[PDB]
Amino acid sequence: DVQMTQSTSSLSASLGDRVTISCRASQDIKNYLNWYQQKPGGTVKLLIYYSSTLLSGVPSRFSGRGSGTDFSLTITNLEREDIATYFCQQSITLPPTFGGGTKLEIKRADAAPTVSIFPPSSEQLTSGGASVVCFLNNFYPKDINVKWKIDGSERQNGVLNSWTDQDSKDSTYSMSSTLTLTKDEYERHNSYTCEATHKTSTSPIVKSFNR
Amino acid sequence: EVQLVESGGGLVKPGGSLKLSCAVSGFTFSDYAMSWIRQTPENRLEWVASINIGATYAYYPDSVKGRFTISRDNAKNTLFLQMSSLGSEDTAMYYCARPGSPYEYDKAYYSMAYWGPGTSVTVSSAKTTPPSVYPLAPGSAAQTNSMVTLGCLVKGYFPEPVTVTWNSGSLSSGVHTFPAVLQSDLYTLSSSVTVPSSPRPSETVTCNVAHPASSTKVDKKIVPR
Numbered sequence: 001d002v003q004m005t006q007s008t009s010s011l012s013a014s015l016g017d018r019v020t021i022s023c024r025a026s027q028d029i030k031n032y033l034n035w036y037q038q039k040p041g042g043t044v045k046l047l048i049y050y051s052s053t054l055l056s057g058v059p060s061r062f063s064g065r066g067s068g069t070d071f072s073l074t075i076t077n078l079e080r081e082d083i084a085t086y087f088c089q090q091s092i093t094l095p096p097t098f099g100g101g102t103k104l105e106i107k108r109a110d111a112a113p114t115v116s117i118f119p120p121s122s123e124q125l126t127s128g129g130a131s132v133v134c135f136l137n138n139f140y141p142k143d144i145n146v147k148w149k150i151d152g153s154e155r156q157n158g159v160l161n162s163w164t165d166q167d168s169k170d171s172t173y174s175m176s177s178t179l180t181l182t183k184d185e186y187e188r189h190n191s192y193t194c195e196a197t198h199k200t201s202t203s204p205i206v207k208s209f210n211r
Numbered sequence: 212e213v214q215l216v217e218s219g220g221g222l223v224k225p226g227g228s229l230k231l232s233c234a235v236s237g238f239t240f241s242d243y244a245m246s247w248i249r250q251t252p253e254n255r256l257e258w259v260a261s262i263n264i265g266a267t268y269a270y271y272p273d274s275v276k277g278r279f280t281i282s283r284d285n286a287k288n289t290l291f292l293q294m295s296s297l298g299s300e301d302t303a304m305y306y307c308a309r310p311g312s313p314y315e316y317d318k319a320y321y322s323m324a325y326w327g328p329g330t331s332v333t334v335s336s337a338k339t340t341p342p343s344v345y346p347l348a349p350g351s352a353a354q355t356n357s358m359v360t361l362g363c364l365v366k367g368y369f370p371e372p373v374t375v376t377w378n379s380g381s382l383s384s385g386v387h388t389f390p391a392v393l394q395s396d397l398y399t400l401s402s403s404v405t406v407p408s409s410p411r412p413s414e415t416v417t418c419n420v421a422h423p424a425s426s427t428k429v430d431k432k433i434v435p436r
């Protein structure tokens with residue numbers, strides 16, 4: 001199979017910026033290379049087919065070019081409706097293969113995370129389990145680290161993190177760290193701390209509580 | 212205009228069978244060679260099956276060949292994909308797609324110009340399990356201030372997805388629902404909502420979590436303390 005290679009999986013840019021996505025084929029596919037666009041929970045859309053032919057409805061600020069083994073997709077005036085994942089695809093050799101995709105981020109100003117810590121609920125305690133949740137919402141850039149300390153002592157066992165894709169309204173990110181314990185080990189301790197290190201503050205944002 | 216809608220997706224056991232459907236509109240179905248393409252949990256697009264006009268020839272990659280079968284009903288405007296002997300590697304979002312042109316001399320012929328929303332196939336021996344929903348309320352002296360964040364913990368369910376709304380959708384702004392993490396073959400995600408400290412506890416915020424797989428709906432009113 002012809003291998004489709006996009007050299008970066010993530011790309012960052014500003015509104016009004018010239019974006020360029022590269023795509024390399026392991027073989028000569030001549031001009032048979034298409035470009036697709038796909039938003040997070042959405043359908044796949046054809047942008048350009050053959051090497052540089054736009055599909056109806058696609059803005060002229062999208063342009064493709066390349067022949068043989070090296071292709072590229074250029075966006076001229078990045079708009080926030082251009083924040084999607086872009087795939088390259090060869091249509092001439094069986095089986096037809098796609099590239100890994102290039103997810104395009106948008107740039108904005110630095111935002112500090114709003115940190116909120118929550119204790120286990122009486123309902124979950126009722127089940128012999130106990131999860132401490134921490135929300136770190138609306139921050140930029142995406143680079144952030146979290147530290148859990150149970151009675152001054154760090155901890156990574158039982159900790160789980162999840163991230164949101166870039167927000168549509170404010171282009172920020174959000175994260176959730178959940179320290180799950182056993183009801184019993186939860187009660188042989190008093191204090192629980194949620195620490196956030198971010199490009200903004202120099203000193204962590206600390207959210208703690210105790211029983 | 213042009214419509215493609217996949218159907219038949221669901222939860223299957225390894226080695227099991229499933230049949231998919233694609234109803235079409237806005238074009239002469241009988242003029243096109245129709246295909247199936249799947250997207251992988253790793254966001255990886257892969258070809259599945261192709262069929263020409265007249266259902267005379269069908270193309271399958273070595274990944275699906277000998278197990279899947281593509282067919283068409285030109286009178287019903289429907290395309291099918293019989294899947295058999297399924298493995299976990301077949302877990303994916305399956306789409307039906309239409310080429311850009313029925314004419315091989317047109318370069319749009321070598322492109323898929325229309326896809327459907329897709330239908331989800333999960334091949335697992337794991338069991339359909341309803342979610343437990345826990346209220347996340349602040350505690351216990353930090354009542355400051357401008358805004359307050361509430362949340363709902365949706366825990367130990369299978370399969371995906373779970374739908375989470377706040378106040379029956381009345382609360383759209385300030386909502387953050389996170390991707391589920393797998394843990395003991397059971398999913399867990401979290402949802403946060405931010406409201407002025409004025410409309411809470413005064414006035415009500417409640418999380419509504421729907422899990423269609425187990426036909427479950429849970430309403431969790433967030434109460435102080």
Ligand SMILES: C[C@]12CC[C@H](O)C[C@H]1CC[C@@H]1[C@@H]2C[C@@H](O)[C@]2(C)[C@@H](C3=CC(=O)OC3)CC[C@]12O
Binds near residue numbers: 091244270
């Ligand atoms: C199924 C098909 C049509 C019948 C003919 O016998 C050739 C086969 C194999 C090759 C196959 C065509 C259908 C066409 O729709 C294709 C799927 C078409 C492609 C579109 C595409 O994106 O990649 C290929 C070019 C050719 C094609 O790959």
